[PDB]
Design a binder for this molecule. Sequence first.
Ligand SMILES: NC(=O)c1ccc[n+]([C@@H]2O[C@H](COP(=O)([O-])OP(=O)(O)OC[C@H]3O[C@@H](n4cnc5c(N)ncnc54)[C@H](O)[C@@H]3O)[C@@H](O)[C@H]2O)c1
Ligand SMILES: [Cl-]
Ligand SMILES: [Zn+2]
Lengths: 318, 42
Amino acid sequence: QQKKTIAVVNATGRQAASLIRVAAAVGHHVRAQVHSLKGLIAEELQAIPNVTLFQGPLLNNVPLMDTLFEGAHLAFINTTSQAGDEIAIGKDLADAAKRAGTIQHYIYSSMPDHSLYGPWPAVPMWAPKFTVENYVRQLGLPSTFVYAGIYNNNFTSLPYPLFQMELMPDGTFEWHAPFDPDIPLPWLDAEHDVGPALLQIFKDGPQKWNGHRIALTFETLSPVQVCAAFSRALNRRVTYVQVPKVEIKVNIPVGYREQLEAIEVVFGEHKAPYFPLPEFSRVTDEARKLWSGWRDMEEYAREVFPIEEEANGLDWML
Amino acid sequence: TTCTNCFTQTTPLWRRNPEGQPLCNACGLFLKLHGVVRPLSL
Ligand SMILES: NC(=O)c1ccc[n+]([C@@H]2O[C@H](COP(=O)([O-])OP(=O)(O)OC[C@H]3O[C@@H](n4cnc5c(N)ncnc54)[C@H](O)[C@@H]3O)[C@@H](O)[C@H]2O)c1
Ligand SMILES: [Cl-]
Ligand SMILES: [Zn+2]
């Protein structure tokens, strides 16, 4: 009923920003930690009225966490490895949240630890989250865990890793990834659907979701099918090409490399599920039930891809 | 057609604004559930 105050970290992150825009819009007050104030997203969030920002790093910084949860009734927590040890940060955040005592619903965005389901290795930017999930549960915080699917918007023709929908000379598009071309993977339109869904979860309350794990994915497509979607949306021919490794065409930070190499082994060699957890092994049922207005890959493909490209610096759409 | 809000032309179902304006599924459903127009980025 009443609109409560929500604590969010990594405000410029796609999941958080999506939640923040819709939350502030409907009347919720937001308190969010951002690494930097400079930036398009950053600047935008600053502009939104009831959005109070706290600039500073999360790592070994309990004073910031305490402030963040002051007067906070809800919380959506999604940390990024870039900020440092996600386990130590995720645990400090949970501690502060309980220490605040006003949190009635703590939504932690989690990810699987693949080594717990097969001879597979632990994807370094995923596994750590599963540990924090356990720690949240351990404190007794009324919580809910959401597992995000692969973002539709990771796609770009630009030379960025793993999800480059490259523009070939002959005006065609080709996407090179380790993923099996036929194995359906869970996708999610972060900017379009994370916010609405999170709101619905908060509106539902812990009375329904407490302790639950929810797969935040609204559609499952294979690398080939995703390619099909782009093709019948841009009028051009798009083809998928399974490559043993991730083509790093630019200078990426060390931590992000380790991540990809792991992705290569899990999805490239072993062809393991994105969500290897038994409860997730349709997985999209809960999400669609929480939010019926999701954006599939085709709409993303036709309505957003062209637009993001142009703004990014490309004119193949003209 | 075209959503009056997000301007998308691709949507699984068209809905309407209390005034008569066409909104896509998401925007229409969002306004109905939360009371305000679906905010967009940028
Ligand atoms: N991309 C996907 O498809 C996908 C799917 C499931 C889970 N995830 C998980 O999502 C998490 C990331 O969350 P997101 O998608 O909401 O964010 P994001 O990838 O959209 O971006 C995070 C933003 O925060 C900034 N940032 C955060 N800490 C920083 C620091 N210490 N120094 C400089 N910049 C910093 C980044 O540069 C960037 O602008 C990851 O842990 C990832 O494993 C991603
Ligand atoms: Cl941030
Ligand atoms: Zn719309």
